Amino acid sequence: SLKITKIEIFHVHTRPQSGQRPILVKVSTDEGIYGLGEAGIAYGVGGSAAAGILKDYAALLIGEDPFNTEAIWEKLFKKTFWGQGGGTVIFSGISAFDIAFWDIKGKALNLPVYKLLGGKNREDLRVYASQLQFGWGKERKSKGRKEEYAEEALKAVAEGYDAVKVDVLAHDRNGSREGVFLEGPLPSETIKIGVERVEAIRNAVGPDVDIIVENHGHTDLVSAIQFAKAIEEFNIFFYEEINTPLNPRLLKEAKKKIDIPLASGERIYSRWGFLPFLEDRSIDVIQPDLGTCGGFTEFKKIADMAHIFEVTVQAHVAGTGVAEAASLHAEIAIPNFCIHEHHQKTLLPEYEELCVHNYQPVKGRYKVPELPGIGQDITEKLYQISDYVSIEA
Amino acid sequence: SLKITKIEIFHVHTRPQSGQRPILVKVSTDEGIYGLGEAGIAYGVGGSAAAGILKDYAALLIGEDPFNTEAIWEKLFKKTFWGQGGGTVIFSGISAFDIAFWDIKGKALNLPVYKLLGGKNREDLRVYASQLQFGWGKERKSKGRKEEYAEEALKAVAEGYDAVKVDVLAHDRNGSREGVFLEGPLPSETIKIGVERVEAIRNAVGPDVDIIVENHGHTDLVSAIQFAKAIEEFNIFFYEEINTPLNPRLLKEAKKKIDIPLASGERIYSRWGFLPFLEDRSIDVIQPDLGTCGGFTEFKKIADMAHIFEVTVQAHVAGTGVAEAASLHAEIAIPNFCIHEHHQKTLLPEYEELCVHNYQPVKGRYKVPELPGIGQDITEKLYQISDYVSIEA
Amino acid sequence: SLKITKIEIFHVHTRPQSGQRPILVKVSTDEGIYGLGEAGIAYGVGGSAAAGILKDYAALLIGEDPFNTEAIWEKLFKKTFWGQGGGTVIFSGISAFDIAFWDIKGKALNLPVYKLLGGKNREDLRVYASQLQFGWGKERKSKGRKEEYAEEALKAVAEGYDAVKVDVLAHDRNGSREGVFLEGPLPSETIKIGVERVEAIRNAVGPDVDIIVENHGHTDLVSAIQFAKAIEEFNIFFYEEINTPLNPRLLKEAKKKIDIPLASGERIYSRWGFLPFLEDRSIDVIQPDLGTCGGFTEFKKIADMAHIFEVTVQAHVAGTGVAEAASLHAEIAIPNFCIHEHHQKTLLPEYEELCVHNYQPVKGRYKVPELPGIGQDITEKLYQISDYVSIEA
Amino acid sequence: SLKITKIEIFHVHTRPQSGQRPILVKVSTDEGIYGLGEAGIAYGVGGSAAAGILKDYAALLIGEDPFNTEAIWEKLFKKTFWGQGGGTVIFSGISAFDIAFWDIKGKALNLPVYKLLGGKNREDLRVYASQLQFGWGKERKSKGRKEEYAEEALKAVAEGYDAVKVDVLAHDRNGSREGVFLEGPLPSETIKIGVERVEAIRNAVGPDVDIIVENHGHTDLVSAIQFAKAIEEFNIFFYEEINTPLNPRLLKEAKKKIDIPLASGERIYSRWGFLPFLEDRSIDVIQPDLGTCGGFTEFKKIADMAHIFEVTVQAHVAGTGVAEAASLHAEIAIPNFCIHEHHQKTLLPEYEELCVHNYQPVKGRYKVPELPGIGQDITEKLYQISDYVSIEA
Amino acid sequence: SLKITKIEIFHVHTRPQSGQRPILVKVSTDEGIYGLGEAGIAYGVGGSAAAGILKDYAALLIGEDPFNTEAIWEKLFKKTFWGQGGGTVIFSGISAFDIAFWDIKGKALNLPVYKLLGGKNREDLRVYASQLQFGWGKERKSKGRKEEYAEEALKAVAEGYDAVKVDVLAHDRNGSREGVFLEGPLPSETIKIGVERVEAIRNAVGPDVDIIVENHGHTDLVSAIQFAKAIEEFNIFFYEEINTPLNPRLLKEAKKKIDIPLASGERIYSRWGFLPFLEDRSIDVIQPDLGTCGGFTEFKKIADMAHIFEVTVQAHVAGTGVAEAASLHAEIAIPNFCIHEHHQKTLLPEYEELCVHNYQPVKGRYKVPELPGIGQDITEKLYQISDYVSIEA
Ligand SMILES: [Cl-]
Ligand SMILES: [Cl-]
Ligand SMILES: [Cl-]
Ligand SMILES: [Mg+2]
Ligand SMILES: [Mg+2]
Ligand SMILES: [Mg+2]
Ligand SMILES: [Mg+2]
Ligand SMILES: [Mg+2]
């Protein structure tokens, strides 16, 4: 019965500490039910392109029935022209709408989204404390000294996390990115900086806390192999984004010389994006972002394909409470779940103020929301602190 | 929440003129909502195994929540031991229950199942008239002379079908399977018999009615290629089950020498079954059966994977109205739908008396049921004409 | 030395006949020299995303030296985060700025851009008349009857073109896209519509006018193969965008069964996008758009790589005179040039009014502009008929 | 001129300690000779399906000559329809009948089955003590403490076994499966539990007793590789069922990382099942079960193919004395035999009461039974403690 | 407007200490602007062939516009016949002229060549001291005793280099090449010679000076693997020219059993030469020589292709100041630069006297020349100490 009547797009003004700008969409229907979604380009450079694609796709969606998520997905894929060429922004547009549609379906049926995605596969979700190099962390500040890495890890363990993730190569010993270059064979001292940080954490947290190493795509396969050799002895849980994902075969080549499990996904989009990595079996833990991979509809398809290849899933989660709530539904509903990412940015007040619920882990575990829909909404403030665009018929 | 309280399995007694024995399952819950499913082993030899697998799986399912379709599928896959070895019977067990679970979800939410599978991708479904060699099709009788093949095709066209399917190799000119053997290089006269039948049909129906050729796995790659060469000139729509699917690479070898699109699926099960054929891109139209491929849950995963490879889908449909109703929901909910199989057996009173609703095409088109759930139920007669097993707490 | 002081972005208001919205960028320097570029998303759905990416990238570019095209390209690729994930909009942003930078270089050195790209490889360029199905063509109007396809081809041949391109599958016999669906095996009547149009064209123009068939990615590999079989007898020059380019291996599968040379590239971006197609040798003529592939800098890299594989190049050209002027420099400067696309849209006044020079073929031949830079500028009107964004300094 | 006149199927009632339900078949002939076979689904979930398949196949077998084992195998493969789709239950049905037919042949000719399979290749068979985690003896009790694993190993060594097999991951330190999950990257403590058990056993038994590690398909590629790293220092003889065998390429991927010889077979069926593993050379020791792989006929074909690839064989043995007696014939008759699997579960009263003869190793060595046929029979008790089905003529 | 009017070729007489004979080309135009280039065959046996190819190519070049570098490259490739067969001498001829043409372009536009190649990617270039085994300084002398290898490394470190390259296998302990044979499995004593030299250098320079090992193609894959095993513990930066490059697959085989990054390129020419190594991903650092790979034009294409594969570039540099000056422009203008080779020969007076500027690193860093053109010229002496050939209209 439902028809989309209004689409509102919020390109949120710069968040002071992080410098980031989340992009949210509110999709309203004739019956007054609305849904929230998020485009997963809150950080880096390109958020205005996400706000733009959402505006353009909106014209094709007014009048549509939000229950028709398969047909709408395929329409944005096949009828936009650019859908068939793919891309970060193209897929973020499809994703944000898809999330909002599933939010609507949940509300329309009086059920949490995970009940519409195939139910629960576990009672709760293991969580890791993500991006310790920026502090754990209501004050965001990049860390340079090895004792600071250990300290931030200890703060997370004190809160009950039994896993942490850290980028140990990005910053020099002053905590600056300035002059740090990580492609090709690395100097001994750069390797030493990474190793001393991993070692300081491992010593501090002991053997029963897992450590994930994040390279942020700053390395390439040559430097990634070199660094893995140096940190292997520390029992690394997995090794994330070790190069550029645009020539997929290179990760298979990296894996030939790296024994640590490999992870990637935040810059790989749709079934088509993940396919070559699965064919190569070069990724052990995939990390699709609901807000870029294609939404709930596509995340499920990616995870389901990945299961055939004995690959597990950790959703990439790095924006507002809309993104984070949504991720919990997607992860609880798949059998092949690894671990949940809990980003340090969620601990900053600039992010906390955006949503009505601040879902936080308890003793390092997350439970899925049990409200109808995704279980999240934006605050009334949002209109006033965003570039705002409204589309109707 | 919702819990399974009772499971009833009906291994239906021999259907007089088809010789078949459908296997249905009724899953009851603590809220009085029940679901119907079907195991796709109604013909050939093995129905009692399907009845037996359902009985064994039932022990694991009493007390479960039918909304947890993902977890239950994974439990039957991973906790039975044999799930991980796979197979016709193993997957038919998972399938029949999965269908009944989705029926339950639809009834619980007062929605047709297609609304829970992602909505409609089209307003109706193109249908073909299947298995003309048995007559179209109120009486089942094998055809021998080429004019009989033309006549049955015309009977279909008169009902408004614009596509037909025929097995032209299975029967000799007297309509007998006796002494017919179709592996290895074929006699000229066997080629001639097949060609004369396709030719008679094509001449009768004209260019605008599609002709699908069914080999029923009676051929192997050698005889399949030899026959394809002889019938290519007749514009064959696709060419189904041309060999044994147990060594998948053989179909890739077949495709090297066959220009006609290839179809298969009724004897290929789960994502894991279809994977090699997709990797080889050797099937143009996959034909999973809901009742053997793993139910709605797995059908969707198969179809969604197939989409990546520009492969389209026609559900294999060859049992009761429970199977047929369920297939309509699965097909309308996918973007990459090809055509729907309407089997001649449904036209027989043996089968019609099993189910409450008799869904039939109108002018060669099917519409999905709009009732809650799959839109089908079993008649009162079923308890009296089945081997009946009931499992409770 | 040279520093970028200002960036202006023009998202041009809807063009009436075509419904399109070009996106232009003007980059100004501290020496008063400015350059023009264009993002190649003027048609389909997503122009606002291109406007948005240009705005976001502009922040990284103020103060940069436009001669540093390599470092700026790598910066936008490696320092934006999303650069390394790729995509239509991501690469369109890099492309538009890159074109403007080369325009600046040419003006600064008082040379046409081709002199900075390695000089002329030929004195002029062979051209085809592109998109006959919309009319050749100061009035845009989709054609339905086969005689109309012949008529439009003759109009082109009368202007001295010895090659034409037509999409013969997209429209029904009424000139309408409504209800036309071209994935999976095709009905005989759809094949007949396509065939009769190719045939009518070939009969009208004779043997010495080449015919390119454009599928616009509406087909998939199955329908593409079926159609190629039907038209091969008409000596098709090449066969463009026959499926979705997101799973590259599928084009290799298509080539196995298609004798006609294959073309693609308007929805493939960067060296990374073309690589798998070259690895498979599945494309005979690549068609990168300067405004999406990565600009002059990357177009050259794509073409140079393609040469190793005995692949030739026709730039995809389908926007304003900025895009068209730019493409002439890129094409004259490469050894492996095939033919130049001259789009019917350039014939419409809504496009004519946007630029200072209206470069048009003479006797089916293009000459490269000989003015400083790309040899093109926007009109004063542009500010008044665009969504306008200015970024300083 | 033997003709099958009667087939009796015994689905044995729950065995109290093991929880298992063996499935036996007795095939009688016109001349009074009968044969015994067993379907290898006695454990896990699915035994009723094996009972059902045997009932269905039985109809095709009345009147056949038991000497025509090749034709009968091919008939059940090719004329049942589901034969060509394969599977655990499908092949278990073929298997059990085949074993009974060879039993008949041996009785008819006054020869043990090994004489009809090509004779002895050795005078006796090396044996390992299997499944120490449930105790070495005939009280079934799952072990949790590392000392208990060593104690059980020493009990076997005391009986003269020079090889043991243990699953060291399945149980927590209290001996429970509850909450144990072994897919994806494993916690350090789970690794430690496995290691401490292997190390306890190694230290106890010394260097000249071999240790096989059984993962029971509870792990996947990722966890299997991780665990192999931790135990490789202990000289593991081979490493069994390390993942799910349904995507065979994954075992090749595992072997890239894992230096310990790999074994699998109990969930892989027929020549067709083993083929991809042999093509990849990913299994060093294959473990087909006579009662699921296709019987003596197919076991021989599998073992003979495996010999080409320098792969050796250990029959999977885990049901009644029928299965155990049969396995000894199959193994002594092949050149490429590795080792025989033994449990003492065999000589529980619940299992020992089923069969006339109790074949047991002596000082870690087995002799093949030297009686006509397989050298085994069922007791009179069986009729009374089984679901009994009889099919006649 | 420019036309080539005169070509002069200087095959320089034997340089006393090195024994080498550089080959230089001076290309003059009607406007009086001239350009200098160099063929990269100054050492080994074949320089007279380089002089001869330049003489032959010169005939095709009189009257050409040196701005037409793409067309001229393609003309020498496609119109000489032997261009399409390839080769050291064939490509050296194209190379030397290409360098001279770019020199002319820079001069004609008052800009350094790097400004015409896409600008700077960095402000300076890291340098290594190359070929320590011949002495680091003004007197060339082959080293035999391990202490001498350390001594030479220390002399480099004292001048501010943080990287060195050495061939440790070429010479026996008395500093002789005679009787040294390095193909096939090596004697222990030869391994010990190489090891003791690497160890002496590592001990002398510490961890923060990188060590490159040069095999000069004297080894093959067997000895290369053997030696890598022995030196892996010394943290070798990369491992250069480890076999013969004429069967490219062999380097892929070597990489399977070598963990040190591999380098090659001075005996690999054009995009076509590097292609198979990139396809195999067997080279981590490519080392094309501007004077053999095809000049600036082709170096850029090689480096750009290499970038797709996460391969970095160090120009091979080993003749006069013409070659070295040219190399700095090529390297600063690419994003994927590794390190610059600074050859000990440049420290000899025989080489210094050939060119007007002696560009030398400062504290181990190079800056690109900023003069117009390549920033280098020959002395007027050169006519008198060369075999001189002049070609005019
Ligand atoms: Cl994009
Ligand atoms: Cl089965
Ligand atoms: Cl040569
Ligand atoms: Mg990350
Ligand atoms: Mg069929
Ligand atoms: Mg096009
Ligand atoms: Mg086992
Ligand atoms: Mg060298």
Measured CA to CA, the distance from residue D372 to residue D370 in angstroms comes to 7
Q: What angle do CA C322, C327, C331 make, to 5 degrees?
A: 160
Measured CA to CA, the distance from residue E331 to residue E299 in angstroms comes to 9
Chain C residues in contact with E101 by the CB 8 A cut-off are: none
Number of H helices and E strands in chain C, helices first, is 12, 13
Give the distance from residue E316's alpha carbon to the nearest chain A alpha carbon, in angstroms: 17
Nearest residue in E to A219, CA atom = E310
Tokens of B14: 């021999």
Measured CA to CA, the distance from residue A376 to residue A112 in angstroms comes to 11
Measured CA to CA, the distance from residue B352 to residue B137 in angstroms comes to 13
Distances (CA, A) of B369 to A66, A243, B104, B358, E246: 20, 50, 15, 11, 68
List C336's β-bridge partners, or say none.
Answer: none
Rg (CA), chain D: 20
Measured CA to CA, the distance from residue A183 to residue A225 in angstroms comes to 11
Give the distance from residue E320's alpha carbon to the nearest chain C alpha carbon, in angstroms: 26
Measured CA to CA, the distance from residue B255 to residue B326 in angstroms comes to 32
Q: Are A319 and A40 in contact (CB under 8 A)?
A: yes
Q: Are A348 and A140 in contact (CB under 8 A)?
A: yes
User: Which CATH class, in words, describes the domain spanning C111-373?
Assistant: alpha beta
Cβ neighbours for B87, distance < 8 A, ≥ 6 positions apart:
B269, D85, D86, D87, D88, D89, D90, D91, D269
Tokens of B155: 């009977």
Q: Are D358 and D376 in contact (CB under 8 A)?
A: no
- Options 3.30.390.10, 3.40.50.300, 3.40.50.880, 1.10.1740.10; CATH for D1-110+374-393 is 3.30.390.10
Chain A residues in contact with D183 by the CB 8 A cut-off are: 310, 312, 336
Query: How many Cβ atoms sit within 10 Å of the Cβ of residue D1?
Result: 7
Domain boundaries, chain A: 1-110+374-393, 111-373
In the block, residue with structure tokens 């291994």: B11
Chain A residues in contact with E279 by the CB 8 A cut-off are: none
**CA quadruple D300, D306, D310, D312: dihedral positive or negative?**
negative
CA A198 to chain centre: 23
Supply the DSSP symbol for D137: S
Chain D residues in contact with B170 by the CB 8 A cut-off are: none
- Best of A310, A314, A334, A336 to disrupt the D interface (most D CBs within 10 Å) is A310
In the block, residue with structure tokens 């009787």: E179
Residue A34: φ, ψ to 5°: -125, 165
Within chain D, strands assigned E span 4-12, 23-29, 34-39, 125-130, 163-166, 210-214, 236-240, 262-264, 285-286, 312-313, 340-342, 365-366, 386-391
Tokens of C281: 């040798």
Question: B323: CA distance to ligand 7 center in Å?
Answer: 37
Three state DSSP letters for C346-373: HHCHHHHCCECCCCCCECCEECCCCCCE
Chain D residues in contact with A312 by the CB 8 A cut-off are: 183-185, 222
Question: D47: CA distance to ligand 5 center in Å?
Answer: 29
Q: Are D3 and D68 in contact (CB under 8 A)?
A: no
Three state DSSP letters for chain E: CCCEEEEEEEEECCCCCCCCCCEEEEEEECCCCEEEEEECCCCCCCHHHHHHHHHHHHHHHCCCCCCCHHHHHHHHHHCCCHHHHCCHHHHHHHHHHHHHHHHHHHHHHCCEHHHHCCCCCCCCEEEEEECHHHCCCCCCCCCCCHHHHHHHHHHHHHCCCCEEEECCCCCCCCCCCCCCCCCCCCCHHHHHHHHHHHHHHHHHHCCCCEEEEECCCCCCHHHHHHHHHHHHHHCCCCEECCCCCCCCHHHHHHHCCCCCCEEECCCCCHHHHHHHHHHHCCCCEECCCHHHHCHHHHHHHHHHHHHHCCCEECCCCCCCHHHHHHHHHHHHCCCCECCEEEEHHHHCHHHHCCECCCCCCECCEECCCCCCECCCCECHHHHHHEEEEEEEC
Distances (CA, A) of B45 to B20, B41, B51, D52: 9, 8, 12, 10
Tokens of A274: 């993940």
Q: Which of E24, E46, E16, E112 is nearest to E378 (CA)?
A: E24
Residue type for A245, please?
P
Cross-chain residue pair E281–A184, CB shorter than 8 Å = no
Q: Which of A35, A11, A128 is nearest to A322 (CA)?
A: A35
Chain D residues in contact with A121 by the CB 8 A cut-off are: none
Question: B322: CA distance to ligand 2 center in Å?
Answer: 22
Among B45, B49, B53, the residue with its CB nearest the CB of D60 is: B45
**Widest distance between CA atoms in chain A:** 65
Measured CA to CA, the distance from residue E10 to residue B19 in angstroms comes to 95
Supply the DSSP symbol for C186: P
Cβ neighbours for D393, distance < 8 A, ≥ 6 positions apart:
D4, D5, D6, D62, D63
Helix (H) or strand (E) holding B83: none
Measured CA to CA, the distance from residue C228 to residue A133 in angstroms comes to 57
Give the distance from residue B209's alpha carbon to the nearest chain C alpha carbon, in angstroms: 8
Tokens of D388: 């009994």
Query: How many Cβ atoms sit within 10 Å of the Cβ of residue B186?
Result: 21
Measured CA to CA, the distance from residue A107 to residue A86 in angstroms comes to 31
Q: Exposed/middle/buried for B259, CB within 10 Å: 0-12, 13-18, 19+?
A: middle
Residue D253: strand, helix, or coil: helix
Measured CA to CA, the distance from residue A347 to residue A358 in angstroms comes to 10
Tokens of A11: 């390109």
Among D220, D247, D257, the residue with its CB nearest the CB of A259 is: D257
Chain A residues in contact with B117 by the CB 8 A cut-off are: 70
Helix (H) or strand (E) holding B258: none
Distances (CA, A) of A11 to A19, A60, A296, C253, E370: 13, 20, 21, 43, 46
Cross-chain residue pair A184–E285, CB shorter than 8 Å = yes
Residue E342: φ, ψ to 5°: -115, 110
Ligand nearest to the CA of A213: 4
Residue D230: strand, helix, or coil: helix
Question: B38: CA distance to ligand 7 center in Å?
Answer: 32
Give the distance from residue C73's alpha carbon to the nearest chain E alpha carbon, in angstroms: 9
Cross-chain residue pair D247–A285, CB shorter than 8 Å = no
Measured CA to CA, the distance from residue B391 to residue B62 in angstroms comes to 8
Measured CA to CA, the distance from residue D48 to residue B55 in angstroms comes to 7
HSE-CB at E183 with a 13 A cutoff on CA atoms is 4
Tokens of D340: 């025989």
Pairing of strands E285-286, E312-313: parallel
Measured CA to CA, the distance from residue E311 to residue B303 in angstroms comes to 39
Residue type for C61, please?
L
- CA torsion B212→B215→B216→B221, rounded to 10°? -130
Q: Which of C214, C188, C189 is nearest to C201 (CA)?
A: C214
Cross-chain residue pair E271–C304, CB shorter than 8 Å = yes
Cβ neighbours for B207, distance < 8 A, ≥ 6 positions apart:
B235, C188
Measured CA to CA, the distance from residue E113 to residue E106 in angstroms comes to 5
Residue D161: strand, helix, or coil: coil
Measured CA to CA, the distance from residue D314 to residue D308 in angstroms comes to 16
Question: B264: CA distance to ligand 5 center in Å?
Answer: 8
**CA quadruple E351, E352, E355, E359: dihedral positive or negative?**
positive
Among B52, B80, B86, the residue with its CB nearest the CB of D44 is: B80
Residue D240 is labelled as binding a ligand: yes
Q: Which of E201, E139, E140, E141 is nearest to E168 (CA)?
A: E201
Q: Are E191 and E230 in contact (CB under 8 A)?
A: yes
Residue type for E44, please?
G
List E10's β-bridge partners, or say none.
Answer: E24, E388
Residue A25: strand, helix, or coil: strand
**Widest distance between CA atoms in chain C:** 65
List D342's β-bridge partners, or say none.
Answer: D129
- CA torsion A42→A44→A49→A50, rounded to 10°? -20
Measured CA to CA, the distance from residue B171 to residue A369 in angstroms comes to 60
Q: What angle do CA A275, A279, A282 make, to 5 degrees?
A: 100
Give the distance from residue B19's alpha carbon to the nearest chain C alpha carbon, in angstroms: 34
Helix (H) or strand (E) holding B353: none
Nearest residue in D to B48, CA atom = D52
- CA torsion E235→E240→E246→E250, rounded to 10°? 0
Cβ neighbours for E254, distance < 8 A, ≥ 6 positions apart:
E221, E224, E225, E242, E243, E262, E282
Tokens of C184: 């999976």
Measured CA to CA, the distance from residue C182 to residue C214 in angstroms comes to 13
Rg (CA), chain E: 20
Ligand nearest to the CA of B53: 2
Among B119, B297, B333, the residue with its CB nearest the CB of A65 is: B119
Q: Exposed/middle/buried for C123, CB within 10 Å: 0-12, 13-18, 19+?
A: exposed
Number of H helices and E strands in chain B, helices first, is 13, 13
- CA torsion A126→A132→A134→A140, rounded to 10°? 60
Cross-chain residue pair D56–B48, CB shorter than 8 Å = yes
Give the distance from residue E214's alpha carbon to the nearest chain C alpha carbon, in angstroms: 30
Chain B residues in contact with D55 by the CB 8 A cut-off are: 48
Pairing of strands E365-366, E125-130: antiparallel
Residue type for E333, please?
A
Extract long-range pairs of C142-149: CB within 8 Å, 24+ residues apart.
Answer: C142/C171, C142/C175, C142/C176, C142/C177, C143/C171, C143/C175, C144/C171, C144/C172, C144/C173, C144/C174, C144/C175, C144/C176, C145/C173, C146/C196, C146/C197, C146/C199, C146/C200, C147/C200, C149/C197, C149/C200, C149/C201
List E39's β-bridge partners, or say none.
Answer: E23
Chain B residues in contact with C215 by the CB 8 A cut-off are: none
Buried b (16+ CB within 10 A) or exposed e, A66-83: bbbbbbbbbbbbeebbbb
Q: Are D225 and D254 in contact (CB under 8 A)?
A: yes
Residue C214 is labelled as binding a ligand: yes
Pairing of strands E125-130, E163-166: parallel
Measured CA to CA, the distance from residue E131 to residue C317 in angstroms comes to 52
Give the distance from residue B337's alpha carbon to the nearest chain C alpha carbon, in angstroms: 9
Among D229, D250, D256, the residue with its CB nearest the CB of A309 is: D250
Q: Which of B37, B78, B44, B76 is nearest to B60 (CA)?
A: B76
Q: Do chains E and B touch (3 or more CB pairs under 8 A)?
A: no
Sheet strand arrangement including A386-392? A34-39, A23-29, A4-12, A386-392
Residue C60: strand, helix, or coil: helix
Q: Which of A100, A74, A77 is nearest to A2 (CA)?
A: A100
Q: How was this structure determined?
A: X-ray
Measured CA to CA, the distance from residue D99 to residue D34 in angstroms comes to 11
Question: B180: CA distance to ligand 1 center in Å?
Answer: 58
**CA quadruple B198, B203, B204, B210: dihedral positive or negative?**
positive
Cross-chain residue pair D188–A309, CB shorter than 8 Å = no
Buried b (16+ CB within 10 A) or exposed e, D201-212: bbebbeeebbbb
Q: Which residues of C touch B (CB under 8 A)?
A: 183-185, 187-189, 220-222, 226, 229, 243-244, 247, 249-250, 253, 257
Nearest residue in B to D177, CA atom = B79
Among C57, C82, C217, the residue with its CB nearest the CB of A88 is: C82
Residue type for E107, please?
K
Q: Which of C179, C165, C101 is nearest to C133 (CA)?
A: C165
Give the distance from residue B310's alpha carbon to the nearest chain C alpha carbon, in angstroms: 6
Tokens of C313: 């190049």
Residue B241 is labelled as binding a ligand: no
Chain C residues in contact with E333 by the CB 8 A cut-off are: 70
Pairing of strands B340-343, E262-264: unpaired
Measured CA to CA, the distance from residue E58 to residue E155 in angstroms comes to 44
**Widest distance between CA atoms in chain E:** 65
**Widest distance between CA atoms in chain B:** 65
Ligand nearest to the CA of B214: 5
Q: Exposed/middle/buried for B276, CB within 10 Å: 0-12, 13-18, 19+?
A: buried
Nearest residue in B to A275, CA atom = B308
Within B188-282, strands assigned E span 210-214, 236-240, 262-264
Q: Are A123 and A105 in contact (CB under 8 A)?
A: no
Q: Which of A45, D90, A257 is nearest to C59 (CA)?
A: A45
Supply the DSSP symbol for B256: H
Tokens of B167: 């097995």
Tokens of D356: 């006339």
Cβ neighbours for B233, distance < 8 A, ≥ 6 positions apart:
none
Q: Which of A161, A163, A182 is nearest to A171 (CA)?
A: A182
Cross-chain residue pair E70–C115, CB shorter than 8 Å = no
Helix (H) or strand (E) holding B227: helix B221-231
